[PDB]
């Protein structure tokens, strides 16, 4: 909301989100108590909508632009888990870090066979 206020004033803004995975994990925690049947790996049934209705308002527009960087945790290093998997579709540049490279001391541990940009 703060970034959108700065955007609508006509400015251009930087928005950094320190771990967006915790926004859906906090939904998984609450989901079962809200009386909703579990889905694929225990995730809330509304995972893709909870994620889209956020990721959709963080965009540039004709009046002003938001540039963003989002850290996206990957549980158990599993890139096919539903939560990382449903996020790749919402980003233009995806930089995929990996443990099998960091444990060589090679930093930044970016995997060039998995990073990509529009």
């Amino acid at each position: 909301t703060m970034a959108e206020k700065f955007r609508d004033e006509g400015r251009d803004v930087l928005l950094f989100v320190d771990n967006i995975y915790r926004y859906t994990l906090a939904g998984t925690e609450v989901s079962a108590l809200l009386g909703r049947m579990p889905s694929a790996v225990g995730y809330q049934p509304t995972l893709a909508e909870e994620m889209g209705v956020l990721q959709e308002r963080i965009t540039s527009t004709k009046t002003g632009s938001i540039t963003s960087v989002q850290a996206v945790y990957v549980p158990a290093d599993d890139l096919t888990d539903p939560s990382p998997a449903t996020t790749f579709a919402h980003l233009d540049a995806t930089v995929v870090l990996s443990r099998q490279i960091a444990s060589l001391g090679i930093y930044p541990a970016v995997d060039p066979l998995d990073s990509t940009s529009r």
């Binding site: 443990r99 099998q100 490279i101 444990s103 060589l104």
Partner: protein
């Protein structure tokens, strides 16, 4: 060669002479000018090598176990 006690005959395995050794040498040149490589005769190795090549193919093991390398 004959000696006081010993005698030894140093045979050789094929007919020798400037007539034949030269044909051998000319063939040895031709095969280097025109790159003629003969196959070895080892059928055992030729089988084992092929079974090993097929078994080791598209194995993708090092992607699967997270061995750094």
């Amino acid at each position: 060669e004959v000696q006081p006690g010993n005698v030894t005959v140093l045979a050789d395995t094929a007919i020798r002479g400037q007539d034949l050794d030269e044909a051998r040498a000319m063939e040895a040149k031709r095969k280097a000018e025109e790159h003629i490589s003969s196959s070895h005769g080892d059928v055992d190795y030729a089988q084992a090598s092929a079974e090993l090549a097929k078994a080791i193919a598209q194995l993708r093991v090092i992607e699967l176990t997270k061995k750094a390398m």
